[PDB]
Paper text:
Local refinement with the mask of the receptor improved local resolution of the extracellular half of the receptor, and the resulting cryo-EM maps allowed modelling of the entire complexes, including agonists. The overall structure of the M1-bound receptor superimposes well on the S3E-LysoPS-bound structure, with a root-mean-square deviation (RMSD) of 0.73 Å. Compared with the S3E-LysoPS-bound form, the extracellular portion of TM4 is displaced outwardly by 2.6 Å, due to key differences in the hydrophobic pockets. However, within the hydrophobic pocket, F2195.39A mutation increased the potency of M1, suggesting that its bulkiness is not essential for M1 binding. In contrast, L2235.43A mutation reduces potency by 10-fold, suggesting that the L-shaped hydrophobic constriction formed by L2235.43 provides the necessary environment for binding M1, but not S3E-LysoPS. Notably, the ligand RMSD (Root Mean Square Deviation) with respect to protein (the same below), illustrating the average change in displacement of ligand for a particular frame with respect to a reference frame (initial frame), is smaller in the M1-bound structure than the S3E-LysoPS-bound structure during the 1-µs MD, indicating that the binding of M1 is more stable than that of S3E-LysoPS. Critically, the metabolically stable agonist M1 nicely fits into the L-shaped hydrophobic pocket in the TM4–5 gap, forming quite stable hydrophilic interactions with the receptor.
[name] is a recently identified G-protein coupled receptor, which has an immunomodulatory role and recognizes lysophosphatidylserine (LysoPS) as a putative ligand. Here, we report two cryo-electron microscopy (cryo-EM) structures of human [name]-Gi complex bound to an sn-3 LysoPS derivative and the potent M1 agonist. [name] adopts the canonical GPCR topology of a heptahelical transmembrane bundle (7TM), with an extracellular N-terminus, three extracellular loops (ECLs), three intracellular loops (ICLs), and a short amphipathic helix 8 (H8) oriented parallel to the membrane. The ligand-binding pocket of [name] extends from the centre of ECL2 to the middle of TM4–5, forming an ~25-Å cleft that is laterally open toward the membrane.
Author numbering: 45 to 342
The structure:
């Protein structure tokens, strides 16, 4: 455990996480207000996005502990219990957000590309069913893993969010490895969905059957590509490097690899958490009614 300099890393992480925290807080507050205050009725996609907003708001509420830890002296003043609570809660919220974004991709694909008329907008029932299942499965994993870590593991210290060996705890490592591959499957589904949606909207706009609103389809096709690219840049490099993280952490090696691996992991955490603040903004910007409201109000 080489105690290497991280003051510049601490400062850059503190600044990045503070900006992400404030932007995500304001964005998720606005998203909750619009999904509750002015949205009387919900469809499957809107319920999905409300749950994404709740997960992102929980990750944003998790962030201030991280910024305080990084800014104070890069040491954790409080107990290991809160360290474990925050560390597990941040990751569970992140993966809930990822899963629900994959479901938003999927139902957008089935609703736009292949649907002919409608499904009478009764897909909401299965939407809350899937949302409840995912939240219950996340909460169960949260409780079991935290209750195992607090008692079974004797590694209690005054340092948090740091690099640790997984010789004592290999279940956490294998569960993280499974999380990465399921995230990659979700990302492949997301990219397929959004490429197909964009191509369908471009061909529909290119046919130009009716002159009115023949240019909004091109805008919607562009928006699909934009949201797919934002998701990619936010999440892909992180889970690309998490493989090297696990490979280095599950075997004995010189700490010289460890500092650069830890620094890369933290930088990728910054990009991943930035999606939390970005997600509410894309809904407001890509919605024609909300965009016009923003344009006329400003
Ligand atoms: C105990 C400290 O945890 C935080 C971190 C280590 O994080 C991991 O190894 C990944 C997260 C993880 C993996 C395996 C099991 C539970 C995990 O915690 C989150 C979680 C909870 C519940 C469910 C769940 O998976 C879901 C699956 C399906 C649906 C919804 C959720 C995930 O350690 P630390 O804070 O020290 O940070 C180390 C390092 N800086 C860094 O960033 O990894």
């Amino acid at each position: 455990t080489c105690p290497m300099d991280e003051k510049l890393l601490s400062t850059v992480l503190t600044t990045s996480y503070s900006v992400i925290f404030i932007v995500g807080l304001v964005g998720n507050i606005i998203a909750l207000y619009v999904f509750l205050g002015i949205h009387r009725k919900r469809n499957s996609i809107q319920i999905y996005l409300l749950n994404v907003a709740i997960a992102d708001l929980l990750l944003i509420f998790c962030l201030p502990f991280r910024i305080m830890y990084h800014i104070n002296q890069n040491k954790w003043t409080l107990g290991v219990i809160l360290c474990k609570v925050v560390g597990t809660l941040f990751y569970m919220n992140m993966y809930i957000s990822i899963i629900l974004l994959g479901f938003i991709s999927l139902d957008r694909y089935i609703k736009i590309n292949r649907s002919i008329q409608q499904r009478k907008a009764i897909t909401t029932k299965q939407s809350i069913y899937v949302c409840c299942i995912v939240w219950m499965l996340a909460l169960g994993g949260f409780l079991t893993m935290i209750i195992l870590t607090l008692k079974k593991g004797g590694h209690n210290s005054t340092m948090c969010f740091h690099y640790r060996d997984k010789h004592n705890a290999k279940g956490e490592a294998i569960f993280n490895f499974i999380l990465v591959v399921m995230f990659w499957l979700i990302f492949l589904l997301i990219i397929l969905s959004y490429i197909k949606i964009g191509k369908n909207l471009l061909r529909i706009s290119k046919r130009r059957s009716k002159f009115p609103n023949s240019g909004k389809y091109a805008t919607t096709a562009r928006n699909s590509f934009i949201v797919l690219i934002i998701f990619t840049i936010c999440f892909v490099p992180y889970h690309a490097f998490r493989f090297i993280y696990i490979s280095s952490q599950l075997n004995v090696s010189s700490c010289y690899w460890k500092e650069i691996v830890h620094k890369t992991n933290e930088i990728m955490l910054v990009l991943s958490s930035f999606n939390s603040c970005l997600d509410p903004v894309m809904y407001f910007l890509m919605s024609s009614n909300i965009r016009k409201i923003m344009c006329q109000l400003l």
